[PDB]
């Protein structure tokens, strides 16, 4: 797939491309508190207010 | 009456009220003392009353209040029943009716809230009597009066504030933090009824644009809400 | 040792003197709180009525299993951890008020007798003290009494001249 | 200076309409200039400016600039849905031109937010009611024929505007918003239910295309796509949780200071 979105690209010319962005095949081309709890104590007091 | 003085120590015993239980979603209750026979009400002294509430319904002990009154009376007959206080922070649905109650006892009912949280730092206290403005070819209703107050005391309390101020200038407890983790291990339906109450007050304030009573249940929900957050 | 003495249970006994100061009767009540360690909290007060009786058999057994009872339906439920007194004469004057803490300490060990002077305790002066009997020797001694205010009540204290969790953790 | 602000205006609105998008940009840039001398000399004066300003935005890919300058020229629907009513001091015909310019600006304002909002316009017209109607249909049909009938108001000079660029550019993006509103969240999906989807969009073939070109774009995330298999695969919390909190007790204290 790799190879025809590169333009039918033969093993070789795709292995260039594989070399240029580091990409290797694998199966395949290999390709890739307190505070919390501060604010909820504000919020439930504004609420009872 | 135009408006309202409350002495440091009402303020205080309210706060020692609420803390002895050790409840955050609870709310306490009581009987003030004072003088309301001019358009400033005083309110001087007061104690805590048992008391308990069931969905609207609520519980005062009548035989509390006219035996420890007849205590107080017996140490200082100048300091009148003249209404009562609880811990808020807010009016409640019930608190004309439980005003209702307090009249027997005396007229017009006074009623106190005391924000024993202190979200607020201007006012630890609400003052309201009960009256209805009426309406023209209808029926009056009743509602809350809110008056100003102001915090003031005689010259015995200013000396012991003033003391007490002057560096400035658990089994039970335990016991709650088992609930809370008992409700926490349970919370799940807890949530499924809060979210069924919270919409049945949306109903309830629909209905009055009753409203009230919506609105109260909708209060519940996120008091409810705001203890599990906090036990967590 | 040390009486660590609540903000109610101190305007409580200053109220309660002054205003037995112009009964021209000596005030009594008494003490609620917890023996904690050594320590002891004196969280609330309350006053018992003015007797004819002087002293020892001024307290009303009547009255005070009906205020207790009243103030457990009240969060409380504070064991009597002692008795305060307003008594004028000084230095260690009367010998009759002494055997009082003697009944109160056979009933409770630990029991601590406190004593207010309202006519002295002026602004920036509190004249009060704290005593137990000892266990040619003294009968009595003094122990220095601290106060205890939470945050909320500190807040709360200082409108005067404006211009519960977390305590159960600790 | 107001006067030269103004002739800068309306020099780079001519170059605009006979006038390369560039150097109209640049000329925008430069003119913006204090907002009270302009209000002092007239009412209308700030309203061209902030249509401008909305044209700039227009031509700019964010369309977030030109809504902000347009609802201050005209009231506009604010965050949290509070109306935004404009003052009515302009000249009629200069109001009249704001309220062109509103119309104008529904194309950006579309764009901003949401939703179905016309009530400050005219409820009889179906030019822009049925437009936001086709658009919460999602279905392109209904869009393509709105602009085959609303080809005039499109076309108003003509080699100007020769081949409506602007509006199919917009219809384009319009009609990606509704299969990104699905927005995944989703583990694990089966092809079909996709494909029954994304057959609704024209090309048949886009879904083995136009899925995997979704991806590309970003706006929805596929996992797992282009597998053997054939299914596709799809501290935070607690932050957005503090967040929504934050929305309550704002609207809290606007009602308690009401």
């Not at chain 2, 809230?113 to 009743?142: C, E, F, H, W």
């Amino acid at each position: 797939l790799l190879a025809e979105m590169l333009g039918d690209l033969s093993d070789s010319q795709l292995k260039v491309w594989m070399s240029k962005y580091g990409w290797s095949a694998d199966e395949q081309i290999f390709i890739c508190x307190x505070x919390x709890x501060x604010x909820x104590x504000x919020x439930x007091x504004x609420x009872x207010x | 009456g135009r408006v309202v003085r409350l002495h440091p120590v009402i303020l205080a015993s309210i706060v020692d009220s609420y803390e002895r239980r050790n409840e955050g979603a609870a709310r306490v209750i009581g009987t003030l003392l004072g003088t309301v026979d001019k358009h400033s009400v005083e309110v001087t002294n007061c104690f805590s009353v048992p008391h308990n509430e069931s969905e609207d319904e609520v519980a005062v002990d009548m035989e509390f209040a006219k035996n420890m009154y007849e205590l107080h009376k017996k140490v200082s007959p100048n300091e009148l029943i003249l209404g009562w206080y609880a811990t808020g922070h807010d009016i409640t649905e019930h608190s004309v009716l439980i005003h209702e109650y307090y009249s027997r006892e005396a007229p017009n009912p006074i009623h106190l809230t005391v924000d024993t949280s202190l979200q607020n730092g201007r006012m630890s206290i609400k003052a309201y009597v009960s009256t209805l403005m009426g309406v023209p070819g209808r029926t009056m209703g009743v509602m809350f009066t809110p008056l100003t107050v102001k915090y003031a005391y005689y010259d015995t309390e200013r000396i012991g504030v003033d003391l007490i101020m002057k560096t400035c200038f658990x089994x039970x407890x335990x016991x709650x933090x088992x609930x809370x983790x008992x409700x926490x291990x349970x919370x799940x339906x807890x949530x499924x009824x809060x979210x069924x109450x919270x919409x049945x007050x949306x109903x309830x304030x629909x209905x009055x644009x009753x409203x009230x009573x919506x609105x109260x249940x909708x209060x519940x929900x996120x008091x409810x809400x705001x203890x599990x957050x906090x036990x967590x | 040792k040390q009486v660590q003495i609540d903000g109610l249970v101190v305007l409580k006994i200053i109220k309660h003197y002054q205003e037995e100061g112009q009964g021209t009767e000596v005030v009594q009540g008494v003490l609620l709180g917890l023996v904690v360690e050594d320590r002891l909290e004196i969280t609330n007060c309350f006053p018992f009525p003015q007797h004819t009786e002087d002293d020892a058999d001024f307290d009303e057994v009547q009255y005070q299993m009906e205020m207790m009872r009243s103030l457990r339906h009240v969060n409380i439920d504070h064991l009597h951890v002692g008795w305060y007194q307003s008594t004028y004469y000084g230095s260690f004057v009367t010998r009759a008020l002494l055997d009082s803490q003697f009944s109160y300490q056979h009933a409770i060990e630990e029991s601590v007798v406190l004593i207010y002077d309202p006519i002295k305790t002026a602004q920036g002066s509190l004249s009060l003290k704290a005593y137990r009997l000892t266990p040619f020797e003294y009968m009595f001694e003094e122990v220095p009494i601290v106060i205890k205010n939470s945050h909320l009540i500190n807040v709360l204290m200082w409108e005067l001249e404006k211009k519960x969790x977390x305590x159960x953790x600790x | 200076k107001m006067l030269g602000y103004f002739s800068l205006v309306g020099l780079l609105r001519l170059h605009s309409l006979l006038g390369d998008y560039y150097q109209a940009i640049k000329v925008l840039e430069n003119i913006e200039l204090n907002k009270k001398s302009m209000y002092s000399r007239v009412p209308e004066c700030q309203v061209t400016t902030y249509y401008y300003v909305g044209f700039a935005y227009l031509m700019m890919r964010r369309y977030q600039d030109a809504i902000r300058v347009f609802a201050n020229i005209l009231l506009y629907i604010q965050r949290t849905k509070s109306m935004f009513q404009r003052t009515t001091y302009k000249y009629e015909m200069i109001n009249k031109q704001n309220e062109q310019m509103h119309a104008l600006l529904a194309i950006a304002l579309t764009m901003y937010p949401m939703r179905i909002d016309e009530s400050i316009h005219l409820q009889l017209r179906e030019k822009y009611g049925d437009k936001m109607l086709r658009m919460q249909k999602g279905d392109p049909q209904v869009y393509e024929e709105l602009f085959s009938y609303s080809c005039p108001k499109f076309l108003s000079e003509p080699f100007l505007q020769q081949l409506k660029v602007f509006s199919d550019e917009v219809q384009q993006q319009a009609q990606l918003s509704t299969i990104r509103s699905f927005l995944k969240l989703y583990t694990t999906m089966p092809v079909a239910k996709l494909a029954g989807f994304l057959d609704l969009t024209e090309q048949e073939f886009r879904i083995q295309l136009l899925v995997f070109k979704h991806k590309m774009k970003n706006l929805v995330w596929t996992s797992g796509i282009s597998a053997l298999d054939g299914e596709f695969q799809s501290x935070x919390x607690x932050x957005x949780x503090x967040x929504x909190x934050x929305x309550x007790x704002x609207x809290x204290x606007x009602x308690x200071x009401x």
